[PDB]
Assembly symmetry: C3
Homo-oligomer: 241 residues x 3
């Protein structure tokens, strides 16, 4: 089973829900491995669409504020983690139920659609903790949002409302919080009735030609990040947090 | 190769005031694109590429822009039919990729299918607010075409393009403008006046400068676009032979 | 510097265009001065570099007086030289290693707009307008805009600016991806500088390295695009269309 996730499947939809509500669904080492196991399963299961979502208040507070060998290992872990999203074969949808921070935001550039509650916020304060972008965001975010918008978020740590994230290309659509659940699931159940192989083959035509590039971006990002974790600037920034 | 107008069976093709206008002309069929119209569009584009016009416009007659592909098996079966349609598609999309002059769409009404996906290859797109945009490929058991699998994520962002291309969502003119597919939307009652006043203005700009500027923008993308086209057409061949497409 | 004012404080180097009586038009000397200002800024102790204009304009772009400075080698040599100069100017922006922010205080035109595509952020007054009338001038795109504008704004929007010479309001440029944010003119300086001074307090290696991971893998493409745009211009400049245009615009 799963300690940190609740994974369910029915009617052509697999739902992966982060399940550390007391910790704002902060991603610890366990959850990194569990998310990868769940995605590996979903890639081979009978579902047409896979959804990631959060339990409760937050979608995710991002990497859990939990040694050269540790930075190597974590960089290796991170690279494999990101690689699962890059290689994921079926439509992948984020259902962003509340605030989203860190690696949980950056991965959104690898998702096929992203629905957000009006109470969702989006925040990538990497530079504030003395680190660099990951999840391929160094490549995807400038492309999605434009460099002039991506920069405020990636380099300068501006926090976006769900409306702003929608306007800037990161979010497909925003629903009021009161009916968010209803509105998203009625849509997704509708999508799960579409010809299965058509959906799968359509995403492959869109994604396949980009994967080699996205894997190289990931590798570059994790290298830089490994460097940042070993730096005095990062330890001081994080200690000073 | 023509003087003022060139007769076609499914198109009206005219040239005045520095603008070649290519208009779909099957209004009783919602300007659906049949085999005849694919070949006729290709000939018109070849002609427009060589005539003295500065700008070329694609539009529809009547209430639709185009309802897209119009819904006989050769001796080598449905497999050969699939390859033949894939080859025709590839050459067709190719003519749009390689078109050397500014190419503008005047979307007077609903656009569906291949007529929408090619808009990714246009220089400008002017829509009436009663224009709607729909690419229900997946609903018909098919996959993207017209280089949309590449151009649409780029233009609209993946998050918006997926909903259009994979899940078959229909966009209003305003949504398509908000998401970068449409240059500008006009009220239907001003549409023809406003669009044609601009276009006639545009056609008075220094002609070589307009052509050379389009070419600086587009030339270095062509090899990639031709490669996307070939891949999409190859995938589509397989879809057309699948249970989902037929059933 | 004759045509710029370069200062540095609070972790920010400010390069300000300084020909207000000529709408901060970029003459030959200003091209060289900007390159030198960026060279100095690349190695100084600031963490953010800002470009802005003095007076009511950001910049009116290339100074058309630049076409009248005819060397002893004639217009052919001049065309070749100025194309190389342009190539190396734009390449300074492509290669600039620290966060580079435009503070667009008023109307911006031509090369001054196109370069915005290579900046990290762009903050504009609601008095700012953006115009790239290359076609009116019988010219073709520069500053990598032939690649960056379609990517940033979408082909459908980029064409109207680049080919057909539409002038954008600050709000439209913000809506279309060129500008990060727009502020009321009355509060613009205080709102922008309050922000920039906070940004300058962020861990400086993180800021530098984050920019490098975003920008480094795209630089070879950008240099190739710049090289091709410049090769075309070298031709355009010697066209009847550009000659006739420049004689008209010089009469304005």
């Amino acid at each position: 089973g799963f300690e940190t996730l609740v994974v369910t499947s029915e009617d052509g939809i697999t739902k992966i829900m982060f399940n550390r509500p007391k910790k704002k669904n902060a991603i610890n080492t366990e959850m990194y491995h569990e998310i990868m196991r769940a995605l590996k399963a979903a890639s081979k299961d009978d579902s047409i669409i896979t959804v990631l979502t959060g339990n409760g208040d937050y979608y995710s507070s991002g990497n859990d504020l939990t040694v050269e060998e540790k930075a190597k290992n974590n960089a290796v872990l991170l690279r494999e983690f990101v690689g699962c999203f890059i290689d994921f074969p079926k439509p992948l949808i984020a259902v962003v139920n509340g605030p989203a921070v860190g690696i949980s935001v950056t991965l959104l550039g690898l998702f096929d659609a992203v629905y957000a509650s009006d109470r969702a916020t989006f925040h990538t304060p990497f530079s504030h903790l003395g680190q660099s972008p990951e999840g391929c965001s160094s490549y995807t975010f400038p492309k999605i949002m434009s460099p002039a918008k991506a920069t405020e978020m990636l380099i300068f740590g501006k926090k976006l409302t769900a409306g702003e994230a929608c306007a800037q290309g990161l979010v497909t659509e925003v629903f009021p919080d009161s009916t968010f659940q209803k509105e998203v699931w009625t849509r997704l159940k509708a999508f799960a009735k579409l010809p299965p192989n058509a959906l799968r083959i359509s995403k492959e035509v869109i994604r396949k030609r980009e994967r080699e590039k996205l894997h190289a971006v990931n590798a570059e990002e994790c290298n830089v990040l490994q460097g940042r974790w070993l730096s005095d600037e990062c330890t001081n920034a994080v200690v000073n947090f």
